[PDB]
Design an enzyme around this catalytic site. Structure first.
Site, PDB file in Angstrom:
ATOM      1  N   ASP B  90       0.686  -1.209  -0.100  1.00 25.18           N
ATOM      2  CA  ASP B  90      -0.036  -0.038   0.055  1.00 25.18           C
ATOM      3  C   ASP B  90       0.779   1.293   0.144  1.00 25.18           C
ATOM      4  O   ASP B  90       2.139   1.179   0.376  1.00 25.18           O
ATOM      5  CB  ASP B  90      -0.974   0.022   1.269  1.00 25.18           C
ATOM      6  CG  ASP B  90      -0.217  -0.114   2.453  1.00 25.18           C
ATOM      7  OD1 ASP B  90       0.732   0.292   2.595  1.00 25.18           O
ATOM      8  OD2 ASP B  90      -0.962  -0.544   3.427  1.00 25.18           O
ATOM      9  N   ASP B 260      -7.802  -7.402   0.352  1.00 24.46           N
ATOM     10  CA  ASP B 260      -7.133  -7.731   1.358  1.00 24.46           C
ATOM     11  C   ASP B 260      -7.974  -7.271   2.648  1.00 24.46           C
ATOM     12  O   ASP B 260      -8.686  -6.347   2.525  1.00 24.46           O
ATOM     13  CB  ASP B 260      -5.955  -6.704   1.180  1.00 24.46           C
ATOM     14  CG  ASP B 260      -6.171  -5.089   1.570  1.00 24.46           C
ATOM     15  OD1 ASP B 260      -6.401  -4.344   0.710  1.00 24.46           O
ATOM     16  OD2 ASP B 260      -5.981  -4.878   2.890  1.00 24.46           O
ATOM     17  N   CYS B 298     -12.542 -28.030   6.715  1.00 25.98           N
ATOM     18  CA  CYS B 298     -11.684 -27.123   6.321  1.00 25.98           C
ATOM     19  C   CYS B 298     -10.436 -28.338   6.112  1.00 25.98           C
ATOM     20  O   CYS B 298     -10.235 -29.209   7.049  1.00 25.98           O
ATOM     21  CB  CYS B 298     -11.010 -26.445   7.554  1.00 25.98           C
ATOM     22  SG  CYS B 298      -9.607 -25.367   7.180  1.00 25.98           S
ATOM     23  N   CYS B 300      -7.304 -27.382   6.095  1.00 25.97           N
ATOM     24  CA  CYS B 300      -5.944 -26.858   6.580  1.00 25.97           C
ATOM     25  C   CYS B 300      -5.280 -27.703   7.697  1.00 25.97           C
ATOM     26  O   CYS B 300      -5.804 -29.017   8.371  1.00 25.97           O
ATOM     27  CB  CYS B 300      -6.069 -25.309   7.320  1.00 25.97           C
ATOM     28  SG  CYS B 300      -6.357 -25.365   8.873  1.00 25.97           S
ATOM     29  N   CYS B 303      -6.748 -27.838  11.190  1.00 27.19           N
ATOM     30  CA  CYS B 303      -7.894 -28.719  11.225  1.00 27.19           C
ATOM     31  C   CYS B 303      -7.751 -30.223  11.079  1.00 27.19           C
ATOM     32  O   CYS B 303      -8.562 -31.154  11.629  1.00 27.19           O
ATOM     33  CB  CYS B 303      -9.105 -28.204  10.298  1.00 27.19           C
ATOM     34  SG  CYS B 303      -9.885 -26.768  10.694  1.00 27.19           S
ATOM     35  N   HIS B 329      -5.506 -21.376  10.698  1.00 29.76           N
ATOM     36  CA  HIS B 329      -6.736 -21.714   9.965  1.00 29.76           C
ATOM     37  C   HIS B 329      -7.835 -20.596   9.124  1.00 29.76           C
ATOM     38  O   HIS B 329      -8.112 -20.910   8.170  1.00 29.76           O
ATOM     39  CB  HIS B 329      -7.744 -22.289  11.068  1.00 29.76           C
ATOM     40  CG  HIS B 329      -9.060 -22.475  10.800  1.00 29.76           C
ATOM     41  ND1 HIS B 329      -9.625 -23.458   9.826  1.00 29.76           N
ATOM     42  CD2 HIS B 329     -10.104 -21.477  11.188  1.00 29.76           C
ATOM     43  CE1 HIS B 329     -10.874 -23.411   9.848  1.00 29.76           C
ATOM     44  NE2 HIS B 329     -11.431 -21.993  10.475  1.00 29.76           N
TER      45      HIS B 329
HETATM   46 ZN   LIG Z   1      -8.728 -25.195   9.358  1.00 35.95          ZN
END
Ligand SMILES: [Zn+2]
Ligand SMILES: [Zn+2]
Lengths: 363, 363
Positions: B90, B260, B298, B300, B303, B329
């Site tokens: 930015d 963003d 999820c 990820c 998880c 996460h």
């Molecule tokens: Zn997750």
């Protein structure tokens, strides 16, 4: 794997290297145990990647929050934090004094944030500990001979109560190990009586307790000189709460097999990084444009990837990533110290390693 | 790869999916850019593992500490933080107002912790930015038409100064891209004049500025309805500072390609976890014994490995690992949202995805 088997593969003087085999894994000795619901700022896979075979579980913190019964209901500490290798749990005795309106009695310690030997053993079972520490009464330093003897004698009675509680719980006795703790402050005759009392009871390993208490390295080494030979030679010798890198080297020269302390993690978050040329404080302005890794030889991921200048900026800004990177490096440095110790003993050159290490570290 | 090439592969209504190719990598659009000397509590490899193609570099923070010239001397921001893929920076304009004794002038902003368009462009060059944002004057909300017009008109003069500074620096013009920022508050005629002024100057992408300012989703969507079609269709459309998951879905339905915001990282450290059934506050007592992952679908690593109960305990104790796991996460959830958006557009079923998403997320 067996429940517990300590095997010594090589010796040099009083120093030993070998392995403890347990159900959840093998521990290379001499071993350093990172202290942790977490090993602060590190995922378990990262702790393992630095080379740790076993971690120390902080019982006092966990019995308060989230509680031992809750962790048991959730499947035990291994499943909870995601560490599937051995965990040694302390008894809660030291921190119950350092961190708690305590009232000490022969039954145990009553405190505000009753912990007896029986409850301490039960809590460690609830956590799913692999190495259970007997519950003892820490001795302040300095201590008079009378007070040191009284505390040691109570600790030996509690050692027997710890043994019996452990043995009465079938699943714990068949899957975990139990260590007794030598007490007696700096007095040789009390250390001998404690060693004899513990050996009569019989334990899987023997800790040297009461020496991480501000007596200074000269005094600690003097006490280790006569205290370690009193312990059974064929069982692990665990120096609780030690210590700085040169302390560890000196303790291994005196027969110690296992170590724990918060120094690499705590001082890591404070900006102290260990190197083979001694510790540095990464906060210092002289690192603001230093593109070198924290240490020139370290193999850890932090030293592969980031500069002193970057970590200096992170720590200056109070960034979480600063704590993560400093801690990973320091924990890796400790494990690389233990590896160099193990290899040099295996090769019969540990004496020369200790001399070379000190020359460079204190240059 | 080219310096910059935006290619639209599929469309559904006003929504588009495609790719921006740049020297340092490919950006899949619609894209979410995690905001970061770090993306708080995450290593760069972890940010990449969640699926991020590009991050947003916070210029205002870096120009103060450690400083743009220092980062340049150390090799640029990519080498410094260890992120080798594109970085959008930015301009510093917004935070110079939100975080600094400011004195605004036609030349620029003078502040205590002179930032002109020329200095902002130079700072982004010093950082090694891949996508450089023109330096503009943020407009408060609410704004009167006169004040909104004055600020927009100054921002368009600064857009021309930004373009010229960028183009006069050969290495920047040949390797980076420059985005202009549409201003004009909520007024359609000012948005049109700004869009026309930016298109006359010519930019690589066009941001919709001034809408992350507390006007509410109804008003934001109403303004996007007429403002996005004013921008060149064949260039990326970047909604700065947005936003919640349903905001992002609604903005993509209105032609936005890039996003963003700090919400997944900031609210992650605060204990808010995003799930397909809406956000949850992991600090709540009802998660203390919940063995399920943060979200049931999820993919990820958090998880895969840890329970709600564990993360609840970490966040309750103020543990650094709590912040690390919550942030990973949440950042992964955002990227999985963007992937579902991209796939559903590619398959001509984004309208149905938006309806299904809202039904479950707000159930
Ligand atoms: Zn997750
Ligand atoms: Zn290192």
């Amino acid at each position: 794997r067996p429940r517990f088997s300590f095997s010594i593969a090589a010796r040099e003087g009083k120093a030993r290297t070998g392995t403890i085999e347990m159900k959840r894994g093998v521990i290379r000795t001499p071993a350093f145990m990172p202290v942790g619901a977490t090993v602060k700022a590190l995922k378990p896979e990262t702790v393992r990647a630095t080379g740790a075979d076993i971690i120390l579980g902080n019982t006092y913190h966990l019995m308060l929050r989230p509680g031992a019964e809750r962790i048991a209901k959730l499947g035990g500490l291994h499943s909870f934090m995601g560490w599937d290798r051995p965990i040694l749990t302390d008894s809660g005795g030291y921190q119950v004094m350092s961190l708690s309106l305590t009232k000490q009695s022969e039954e145990g310690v009553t405190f505000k944030s009753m912990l007896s030997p029986e409850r301490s053993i039960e809590i460690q079972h609830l956590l799913g500990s692999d190495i259970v520490m007997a519950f003892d009464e820490c001795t302040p330093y300095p201590a008079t001979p009378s007070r040191a003897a009284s505390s040691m004698e109570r600790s030996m009675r509690w050692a027997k109560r710890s043994r019996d509680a452990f043995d009465s719980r079938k699943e714990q006795a068949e899957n975990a190990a139990l260590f007794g703790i030598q007490q007696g402050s700096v007095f040789e005759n009390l250390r001998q009586q404690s060693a004899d009392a513990l050996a009569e009871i019989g334990f899987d390993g023997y800790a040297v307790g009461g020496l991480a208490v501000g007596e200074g390295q000269d005094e600690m080494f003097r006490v280790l000189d006569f205290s370690v030979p009193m312990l059974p030679d064929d069982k692990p010798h665990y120096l609780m709460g030690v210590g700085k890198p040169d302390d560890i080297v000196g303790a291994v020269e005196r027969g110690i097999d296992m170590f724990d302390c918060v120094l690499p993690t705590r001082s890591g978050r404070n900006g102290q990084a260990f190197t083979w040329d001694g510790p540095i404080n990464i906060r210092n302005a002289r690192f603001s444009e230093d593109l070198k890794p924290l240490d020139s030889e370290c193999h850890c991921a932090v030293c592969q990837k980031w500069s002193r200048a970057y970590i200096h900026a992170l720590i200056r800004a109070g960034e979480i990533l600063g704590a993560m990177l400093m801690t990973e490096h320091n924990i890796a440095f400790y494990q690389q110290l233990m590896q160099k110790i193990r290899d040099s003993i295996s090769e019969g050159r540990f004496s020369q390693f200790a001399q070379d290490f000190r020359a460079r570290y204190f240059a």
